[PDB]
Design a protein around this ligand. Structure first.
Ligand SMILES: COc1ccc(CC[C@@H](OC(=O)[C@@H]2CCCCN2C(=O)[C@@H]2CCC(=O)[C@@H]3CCCC[C@H]32)c2cccc(OCCN3CCOCC3)c2)cc1OC
Length: 128
């Protein structure tokens, strides 16, 4: 399964090197440019609990998910992982609960100590 493949081949992109956020590039994006803190970022994604029956996709709602990079508007794994991406890149991300919703989780939807998996496509980014 895709989560096991990130475990095996995924680069640790954390500062602390605690494997809390693992990344594999599934499709290479354009040029060299990666987004800056405060850039307005547009993505499509697919998210699920790593071993769990909860699945969420922006493709469903026919609208890119938009947020402000590095400002704590998303879980930590995403502030870390999306800052590494190029435009048009698709990556897989495996996120320990430390970089997601933690010991608390976010009930009823997200349980305690949940490891999350994402496929993220970076569509665009532009300066705020
Ligand atoms: C600093 O720490 C946190 C920061 C923010 C949040 C809010 C949750 C935030 O969602 C997320 O961080 C991630 C990454 C972006 C995709 C959504 N996501 C998830 O976990 C999804 C949420 C929906 C869901 O039930 C999914 C189940 C399968 C796992 C992925 C889950 C989310 C959800 C919905 C909308 C969001 O919008 C950003 C809003 N911005 C820009 C527009 O104006 C308001 C600000 C953001 C929690 C945090 O917990 C530690």
């Amino acid at each position: 399964g895709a989560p096991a493949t990130v475990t095996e081949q995924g680069e640790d992109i954390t500062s602390k090197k605690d494997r809390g956020v693992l990344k594999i590039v599934k499709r290479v994006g354009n040029g060299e440019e990666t987004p800056m803190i405060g850039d307005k970022v547009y993505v499509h994604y697919k998210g699920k609990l790593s071993n769990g029956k909860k699945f969420d996709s922006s493709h469903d709602r026919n609208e890119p998910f938009v947020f402000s990079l590095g400002k704590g508007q998303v879980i930590k794994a995403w502030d870390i992982g999306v800052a590494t991406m190029k435009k048009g890149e698709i990556c897989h991300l495996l996120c320990k609960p430390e970089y997601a919703y933690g010991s608390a989780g976010s009930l009823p939807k997200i349980p305690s100590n949940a490891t999350l998996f994402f496929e993220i496509e970076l569509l665009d980014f532009k300066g705020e």
